[PDB]
Amino acid sequence: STGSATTTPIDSLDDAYITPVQIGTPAQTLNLDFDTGSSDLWVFSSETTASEVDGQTIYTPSKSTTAKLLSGATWSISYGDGSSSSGDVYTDTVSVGGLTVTGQAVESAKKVSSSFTEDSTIDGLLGLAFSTLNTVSPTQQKTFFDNAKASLDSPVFTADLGYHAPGTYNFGFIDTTAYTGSITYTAVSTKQGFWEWTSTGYAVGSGTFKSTSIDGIADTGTTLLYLPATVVSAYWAQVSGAKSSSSVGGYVFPCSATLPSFTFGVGSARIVIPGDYIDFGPISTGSSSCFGGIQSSAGIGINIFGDVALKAAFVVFNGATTPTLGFASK
Ligand SMILES: Cc1cc(C)c(CCNC(=O)[C@@H](N)Cc2c[nH]c3ccccc23)c(C)c1
Numbered sequence: 001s002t003g004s005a006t007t008t009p010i011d012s013l014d015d016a017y018i019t020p021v022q023i024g025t026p027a028q029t030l031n032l033d034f035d036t037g038s039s040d041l042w043v044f045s046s047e048t049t050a051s052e053v054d055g056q057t058i059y060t061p062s063k064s065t066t067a068k069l070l071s072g073a074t075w076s077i078s079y080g081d082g083s084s085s086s087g088d089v090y091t092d093t094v095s096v097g098g099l100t101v102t103g104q105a106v107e108s109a110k111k112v113s114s115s116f117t118e119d120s121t122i123d124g125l126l127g128l129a130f131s132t133l134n135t136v137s138p139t140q141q142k143t144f145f146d147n148a149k150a151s152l153d154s155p156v157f158t159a160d161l162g163y164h165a166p167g168t169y170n171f172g173f174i175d176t177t178a179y180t181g182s183i184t185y186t187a188v189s190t191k192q193g194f195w196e197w198t199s200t201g202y203a204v205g206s207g208t209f210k211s212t213s214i215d216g217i218a219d220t221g222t223t224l225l226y227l228p229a230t231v232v233s234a235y236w237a238q239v240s241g242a243k244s245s246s247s248v249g250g251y252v253f254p255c256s257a258t259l260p261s262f263t264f265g266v267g268s269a270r271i272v273i274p275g276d277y278i279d280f281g282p283i284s285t286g287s288s289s290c291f292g293g294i295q296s297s298a299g300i301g302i303n304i305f306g307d308v309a310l311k312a313a314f315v316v317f318n319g320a321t322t323p324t325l326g327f328a329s330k
Pocket residue numbers: 016033035036037038079080081083115122125219220221222299300304
């Protein structure tokens with residue numbers, strides 16, 4: 001089998017991407033944030049504290065003839081940025097395009113933190129990291145991809161995120177028309193539960209490529225590109241007036257700037273992030289200071305190749321017996 005669904009930026013800055021997902025019988029369609037940095041499929045629901053719902057579409061398991069409460073199962077997730085959610089668990093039928101998993105764990109939120117409430121465009125997250133990170137207790141549950149993998153024509157999914165435009169998540173096949181050149185594959189460590197890999201270096205604009213190992217995760221659920229402070233300083237030094245602001249929380253730059261590109265290495269291959277991808281707009285409404293899309297990882301503990309980097313590439317998440325990551329230009 002295969003599946004294919006269009007993923008759409010939630011706003012004019014590409015702050016996140018939402019993909020329609022069918023849950024239950026009859027189908028309830030929710031717009032989920034496909035997150036290769038976590039492993040829980042959780043949704044706003046009829047159980048969610050009413051004051052914590054503000055425009056999201058909810059899953060109502062009592063209206064699904066295939067939903068079954070997973071007795072005694074609860075979940076609770078604390079993302080590294082300080083957001084969180086928790087609740088109870090149903091098994092139900094979940095489809096992404098033409099791809100269907102019966103008996104998928106659907107984690108129904110009873111509580112969400114304020115940032116999720118305040119984002120009316122995201123109805124939940126669909127985790128695509130490794131199932132060892134799943135938070136359901138006392139019986140850990142599998143991700144949608146893990147459940148689907150044996151049925152897929154090939155045990156893969158691909159992320160093709162657009163810049164200010166829709167893109168595509170494919171399951172079970174590689175669309176050879178969706179990229180230029182070839183796909184370069186690179187090793188993955190699964191020990192921490194992430195799609196953890198090592199970039200071979202970077203360049204700023206037309207500058208000389210620096211060969212240096214940069215360990216990090218491929219995380220479709222993170223907006224920005226978070227890299228070591230040395231790398232980030234080298235980038236913003238090329239932008240007149242850019243500076244790291246403690247009050248704002250990272251590098252800011254004049255909104256009148258035209259930004260240089262940023263290149264990262266995948267083996268001997270190179271992915272070029274165009275400069276415009278690194279502009280995340282005014283720091284506050286009406287400001288002439290803009291927030292940078294490349295930021296220091298120093299306070300995080302790991303480098304994060306988030307959407308800023310991933311949207312410049314066609315990315316293969318290869319779930320073969322030994323997982324690997326593939327990147328192509330597009
Ligand atoms: C200090 C610090 C700061 C950041 C930015 C991060 C990355 C957080 N990014 C995720 O954890 C996403 N994989 C998932 C995610 C978290 N919050 C969301 C809100 C909306 C949509 C998706 C999500 C970490 C690990 C640590």
